[PDB]
Design a protein around this ligand. Sequence first.
Ligand SMILES: CCCCCCCCCCCCCCCCCC(=O)OC[C@H](COP(=O)([O-])OCC[N+](C)(C)C)OC(=O)CCCCCCCCCCCCCCCCC
Ligand SMILES: CCCCCCCCCCCCCCCCCC(=O)OC[C@H](COP(=O)(O)OCCN)OC(=O)CCCCCCCCCCCCCCCCC
Lengths: 175, 46, 347, 99, 83, 98, 171, 115, 318, 96
Amino acid sequence: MTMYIAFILSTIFVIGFVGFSSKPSPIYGGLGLIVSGGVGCGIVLNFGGSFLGLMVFLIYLGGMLVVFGYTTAMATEMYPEVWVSNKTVFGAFVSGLMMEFCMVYYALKEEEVEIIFKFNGLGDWVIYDTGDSGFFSEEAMGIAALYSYGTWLVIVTGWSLLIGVVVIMEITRGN
Amino acid sequence: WKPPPWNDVDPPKDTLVSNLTLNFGPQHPAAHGVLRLVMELSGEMV
Amino acid sequence: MNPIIYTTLIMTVMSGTMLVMISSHWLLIWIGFEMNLLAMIPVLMKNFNPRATEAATKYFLTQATASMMLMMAIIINLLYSGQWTITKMFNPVAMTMMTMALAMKLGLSPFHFWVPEVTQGISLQAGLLLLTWQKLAPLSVLCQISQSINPNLMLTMAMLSILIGGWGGLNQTQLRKIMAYSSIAHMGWMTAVLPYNTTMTILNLLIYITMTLAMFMLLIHSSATTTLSLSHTWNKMPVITSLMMVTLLSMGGLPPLSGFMPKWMIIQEMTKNESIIMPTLMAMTALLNLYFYMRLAYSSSLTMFPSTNNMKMKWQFEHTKQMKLLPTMIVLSTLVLPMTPALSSLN
Amino acid sequence: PFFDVQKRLGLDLDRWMTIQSAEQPHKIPGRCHAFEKEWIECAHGIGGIRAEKECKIEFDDFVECLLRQKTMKRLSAIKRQRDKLIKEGKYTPPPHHLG
Amino acid sequence: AGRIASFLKNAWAKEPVLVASFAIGGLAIILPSLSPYTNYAIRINRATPYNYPVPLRDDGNMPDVPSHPQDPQGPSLEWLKNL
Amino acid sequence: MPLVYMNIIMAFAIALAGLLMYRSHLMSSLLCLEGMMLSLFIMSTLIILNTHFTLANMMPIILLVFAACEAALGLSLLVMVSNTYGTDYVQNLNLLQC
Amino acid sequence: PGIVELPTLEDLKVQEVKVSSSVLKAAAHHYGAQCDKPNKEFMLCRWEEKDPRRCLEEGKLVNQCALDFFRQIKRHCAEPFTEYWTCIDYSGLQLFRHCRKQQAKFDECVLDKLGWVRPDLGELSKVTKVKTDRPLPENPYHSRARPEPNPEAEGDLKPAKHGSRLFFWTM
Amino acid sequence: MNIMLTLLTNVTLASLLVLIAFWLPQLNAYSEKTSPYECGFDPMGSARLPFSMKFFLVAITFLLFDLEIALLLPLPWASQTNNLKTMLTMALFLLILLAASLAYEWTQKGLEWAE
Amino acid sequence: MFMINILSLIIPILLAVAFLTLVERKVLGYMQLRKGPNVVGPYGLLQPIADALKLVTKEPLRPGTSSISMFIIAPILGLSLALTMWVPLPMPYPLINMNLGVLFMLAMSSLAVYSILWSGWASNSKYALIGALRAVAQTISYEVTLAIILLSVLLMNGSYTLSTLITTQEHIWMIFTSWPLAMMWFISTLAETNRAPFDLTEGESELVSGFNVEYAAGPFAMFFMAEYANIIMMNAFTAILFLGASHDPHTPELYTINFVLKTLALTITFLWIRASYPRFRYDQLMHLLWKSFLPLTLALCMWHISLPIMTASIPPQS
Amino acid sequence: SMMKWNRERRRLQIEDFEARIALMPLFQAEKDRRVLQMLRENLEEEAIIMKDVPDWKVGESVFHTTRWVTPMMGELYGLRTNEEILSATYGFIWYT
Ligand SMILES: CCCCCCCCCCCCCCCCCC(=O)OC[C@H](COP(=O)([O-])OCC[N+](C)(C)C)OC(=O)CCCCCCCCCCCCCCCCC
Ligand SMILES: CCCCCCCCCCCCCCCCCC(=O)OC[C@H](COP(=O)(O)OCCN)OC(=O)CCCCCCCCCCCCCCCCC
């Protein structure tokens, strides 16, 4: 319920990740990944990251993964390797649905899950901070500083992107 | 195991491209209903 | 590739490494690593042979994975400390996390598996850049964060680097694979002393730089990639084979040659740090490098392998290359032991 | 950095953003501006070795400020005992709990 | 001279698009420096009070800051409403 | 530390395993790689938004625009492999060997 | 590690203004300049004392100083207040642009009834000097003692004794 | 509360709208009816082959182009900064480099993709 | 009562889409001097009902080589996204007053390409496969101009809040300030929505029926409904963006009159274009976008970023 | 025309902002009283429920310093209803 709503979105995020990480068909893996891409935005939205949340929709859901479909349409291994095609992918998918189900139950009971880090299984809502942001959206003012203080990053990010296009055509030119 | 070729140009394998024989028509509206135009295409290039 | 395009691609690769060494912010450190990666692949693609494509693909997959794995070390350190400054970080798991992340870029532990194969596929000039310049950037981070490292974890990674790097070198015919295995072995020597005193980690770097420039550009001048192909070079230009055997002996570390200076100082440092078993074992494995070093020296100039009648044309013509900085390279790479106390300049 | 060019020529490239108590857009604060400012001024001109132990108090307080581990554990133990008690019907929440 | 005018006109004969975009982008960068309103733009941008102007401790001898948000002392923006 | 942070951290770790545990389609490998950064992009937003590190709202885009750049390289290498070999298999991508 | 000292609920039972948001917004301009002195005193305390519990006495004063601002207008033309704040309430964003006539009618009284004046643009955003009697806090952050910096280098540089002193190298 | 509720309503509306478009028409498909349609003639076995480079080349250029435009979404709030001159210079830089990437891509064939 | 309002929004649009087939059929016929549907009911008013319930009663044949789960998910995404396109619209008072509605508008519109890619792959036929691949290729080329146009257009608005567009155009239509962009935005909307000359995605004459080459009966209407729903929404989006209307708070009735009347005019000129121009070609389709559209959009964006600074006319972010 | 209209809007915005500046005093005082009063209710509730705990002395300062820390939302609304939690944490965030 809405008590632990962000508990939910985080959960489909994990199962969405287990989807493509289980190495299913690249389109199906794309389907599982974009599902995780879709649900992950809600996690950021719940924290007030509307601008950041909307971007991953734009340049990662409607961005990177669209051209991924081209290579899948270009690869086209002679038979679909959808989940029914192989049995290891089922085992990979089935497995990846266990331990995260195990530790949430581990975290829901006593909350003292010590996997690598100590972790609290308390409700997602707690770690939020109380305080008005006035009229300036904190997310917006942070990003807009791109052109105020992020001068140095802008040059390096731009220069690499320019070098990004010079390499891509050069490697793909095939001599 | 075979020592690598001296020029480092390992020998290209068989052709990995095709000309995609397409059976245009006859049901195709552009085929005037009765055209069996079949062509060879390297992508859009024919 | 157009020379102007080639010059720019090298220019960004140099700047990307330069960016890493000059950034006080963890994000910018990552920026340098990725944009250095972003321009490394096309240089390996200059020849554009199927072997190169296999080499470049292997190189990109391991480097991209290591760089992406590097982000969590930054993120986890961020999460537990909220500090983007590149300093002594505040999480053992994050400290552990990046140490293998950077190690994969250098290729010391089993991570090193990409180092030989990528060098084999790609051209001699590209291998020279990959094994010399592309090792400054990962080392730069380790020098800055040396105070936070777990001593046990890093010393191990250094150990298998010299251990495996030297051990497999006995079974390499292609000179490119020999050089990479030598590189992995030399990687361990600098990395071992890294937690103790970073001054001679650098000293090992420039010195190890000198032979690898010396050896590779000698090999390029020879235009030979295999042991047998190298052997025939005695007939054409016996003098070059003579200098190469000096560097081969020097890079092996026999005194009073230059290559002994790093190892000697390395043993001295950890001996001051009460670690005395650790230096001894690396010295024992140092002879492993010397063996196939001798084998190449035996094939190159110490003996005189048979030649081919077609070598007679090579006598008539001459080399058109300019081998820039080769004269001063080998001299600085074979007799600099008397100038050892100059290492305090690095400090 | 390895080569602190920024310090030599004095052009700020990245350090404007390395910590959250520096200048911020519209002068709005971070979550732990008060704590990290205290830790920073504690550990200035001291050295990493000495500042690890001498300014320990300012650190774990600042770490607790942004992690909020023990505070969350405090609330968890408060909540855990609550449901371990009210379910037994030993104490009833007052109206202001329920509005 | 003769080549420049011919080349520009000749280019405008085949392609009218990029010459139009080049002209627009050419304008888009110079007059920002030449405009007299950019200083006005940053002045009104600074004039917007997003945050509270926290009061300053009055200990005497700062006449510039007013003691009331009606006194003539302090910054004034009578240009703004006219601008 | 909040339960959600496990979910992204474990998401990365299982994404990391899929990147390393291969199969026969490095196309699928690239999916784990870009999913790998998506968790990195996602998680980075949580801390930065939570701690109000306003100027640090920078890097989620910066990390995005650079992780996206590797897609350009990675996918370009994909078609290069799928031209000298035709397919995107990984077992056949062993011509180096010696 | 101590007590989070919290004030008792007794001092928190202060009179609170009971008016909808549009009521505040409609008279906000005619409220800020005319109750500035206690408002500045309280908010100076908030930024100087840096602790909520220190400014409790001033916290009820501004609330009190709001009420005697919200009482004479009842003994004066409360009727122009009604439709003015009603019209402002109709706006989704409480925009003054749509409802200016009622603003003029509201402004017309207070120019003569209580003799107030509409503050001009930028006047409310002016930084003002507030005159208080409370002492400035010594360590608002409650800072502890500071670690003593390690002693600095001093004395003229002398040549290194017996050269590099590294193994057999004499110089 | 309402946002995913709005998302929820549309998806059910779509799913039922296809559900009563699937079970209602009393599916009566045969083998030849379900056979692929290829201009009325026999399919020779296909749709599993690579397509050169032009479709891939434009996709990567679009992806790279989409990433730079991603860098310049925050411009509407960027104009509200205190230091416009730095912002004006910096935003102009992204656009001219966006131009330069297009400029190179145009000059070295590029957008005239392979055939 | 939030729920009844939702059905009060999605139900009328679906009925609007059905009637859009009739009016387009008649108007397109009238250009061709024909009459269009006038036998089925008075002036063909029941033709949308006749077409709708005839196709529903036609079996939804699934192709032999189809992934049924893959075949079905694509219409669900396509139709739901099209209906979701209207939830942030500033219709009197916007339903979902998302402060970043324009980004939400663009992200959902860009997510529509997954239906195109998935439908082509699930159909599993060469004709459908290359039909879809070029379809998305046409699709993915143009929204970069969409984003650039919006960034330049919204720059003088103040933010990405769609409701703020009303107050920006309170005096004059926003087309007058950016009419070079207005035609720039308009043409790109046809390419996104895949109408002639940008109909090579479907290409009735030469690509049979594009990605709908096989897609039949039951779920075919979903792409058809989603396609035509986008036509109104894109024209509605253009209507608010450039052809703004005055909005009295005490009478939202009036601005609805202006917004509605404009958006049929914008839809009417859509099929007006269809009934006049030849169909484009794949290479010209890319060449026109990348050679004569992208450079112009860049310069105009450069013109519109610096314009508020050189005139001290930056808009408030609120 | 637009530059005049945009210039007018900026005057409107600063006028709107100025109203908020005047409204901060009453708002800050009201939120100041509300937040620490509601904390006291939590502390009062702590000392009816932690009496039987073997080691729990009320009012523990988790932070070692004596400086006031803004109360984390967990200890603020943690002992309230589900409506109070939902309407406070994501109440602004949802608000379609
Ligand atoms: C101080 C002033 C500042 C601003 C000054 C700006 C410059 C002056 C104004 C220039 C014109 C406006 C900007 C450019 C517009 C054209 C862009 C372009 O590429 O044009 C050539 C392009 C391409 O023409 P082309 O392909 O023949 O030639 C281009 C050049 N070569 C050959 C080198 C490639 O024209 C088209 O694309 C034709 C239209 C295609 C779409 C088909 C449908 C058209 C429907 C038209 C009727 C409906 C219009 C609706 C308008 C909106 C209503 C809301
Ligand atoms: C630390 C231990 C030692 C380490 C180094 C050991 C190196 C050698 C080890 C063995 C190497 C393998 C076996 C021998 C290989 C020989 C290679 C070769 O090319 O030999 C043949 C070649 C023929 O000679 P050529 O090249 O024609 O040049 C003649 C001089 N013009 O010969 C040559 O090319 C050699 C040319 C040598 C030229 C020498 C010039 C000397 C000049 C001295 C100047 C002194 C000035 C003094 C001033 C005093 C006052 C200040």
